From a paper:
The polypeptide chain of HlyIIR contains 201 amino acid residues and has a molecular mass of 23.5 kDa. The hemolysin II regulator gene, hlyIIR, is located immediately downstream of hlyII and its product regulates hlyII expression by specifically binding to a 44 bp perfect inverted DNA repeat (22 bp × 2), centred 48 bp upstream of the hlyII transcription initiation point. HlyIIR negatively regulates expression from the hlyII promoter in heterologous system in Escherichia coli cells. In general, the N-terminal domain of HlyIIR exhibits high sequence homology to members of the TetR family while its C-terminal portion appears to be divergent.
In the final model refined at 2.4 Å resolution all residues are within the most favoured and additionally allowed regions of the Ramachandran plot, with all stereochemical values within or better than the expected range. The model contains 179 amino acid residues (Ser4–Lys198) except for a segment of 16 residues (Leu170–Glu185) for which there was no clear electron density. In the crystal structure, the biological dimer is generated by the crystallographic 2-fold axis. The dimer of HlyIIR has an Ω shape, typical for the TetR family of repressors, with overall dimensions of about 60 Å × 60 Å × 25 Å. HlyIIR has an all α-fold, with each subunit consisting of nine α-helices. A monomer of HlyIIR can be subdivided into a small N-terminal DNA-binding domain and a larger C-terminal dimerisation domain. An important feature of the HlyIIR structure is a large internal cavity in the C-terminal α-helical bundle. This cavity is 18 Å long and has an internal volume of ∼ 550 Å3. Most of the inner surface of the cavity is lined by 25 hydrophobic residues contributed by helices α4–α8. The presence of this large cavity and analogy with the structural homologues suggest that DNA-binding properties of HlyIIR are modulated by interactions with a small-molecule ligand.
Author numbering:
A (entry chain A), B (entry chain A): 4 to 169, 186 to 198
Write the structure that this text describes.
Amino acid sequence: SREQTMENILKAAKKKFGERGYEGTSIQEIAKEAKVNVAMASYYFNGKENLYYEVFKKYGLANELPNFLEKNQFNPINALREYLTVFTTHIKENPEIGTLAYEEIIKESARLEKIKPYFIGSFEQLKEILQEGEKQGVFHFFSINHTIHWITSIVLFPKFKKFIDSDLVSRIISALTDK
Amino acid sequence: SREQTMENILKAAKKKFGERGYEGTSIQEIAKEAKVNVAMASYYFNGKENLYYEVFKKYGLANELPNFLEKNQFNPINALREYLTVFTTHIKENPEIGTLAYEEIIKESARLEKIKPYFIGSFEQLKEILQEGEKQGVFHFFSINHTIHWITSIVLFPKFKKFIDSDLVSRIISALTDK
């Protein structure tokens, strides 16, 4: 069926886009990887750019993410522990956010507005947790922005952690709570 | 002459690699951009991978970077001011470090060891300045690592600054000196 095929194409697309980035990947490489022809792939998704958006729309974590504050009765340490655990485990297991979050959030712009709706929640929530923590007097920081900056970096990019340095959840909590 | 031609190819390569990343760019695209043929390009640089290293070796800033501490008589504020100014101006004017520092330092590994020698000095120096500042009691921070993490991010990636937030040298100095 068209839908099942489209699921196979998306899986192939996550892989190739994760490898080469948007501008580095052709619909042909994805079609080859999916064992379908280009015209079919292009028809089903209405082109490479929509196919790319569909990868975020299918594999983006935000849509199915619980509200961690609410789930933890607004305990900002428990909420943050749960949030970081959910993230670090998923990111190591799927390092196609490594390349694609970098390209689109960190470096760039062109397609930004189209994909934002699929990662901005993850950031809005981290911000909520840090600010609820600050409000409750348990977290301390100069800039919410830099804190967001540095938490993101060390979570998304564990090999850059290595480059510098040369578990993580508890390390982040300890940094935040220090006075 | 072979050398002049190679300079034209390198300029073309900085551009295309900056656009599409290593795995996203072919020697053919660079050859086309340079108005030479592929065999010549490939012969002159001994292949795409060496050509890539040559881009770092030619456009990497570290090799011609002064020692900012020494230049500023070991005043860590003046040194850091000068270091950040040199960096932010060069990075905005050449956003082919944006993509290539991300790909190689931040995300990845494969070719890491080959290119490190061409950016590790920039990081070693920032570290020196921050630590000399800390030693002299003027800079205050929990983790030298996170500080390196967050300074890098907001300097390299000004559009991610915007995504979050939604001049810089003085902002960084002020964050560091606060107690």
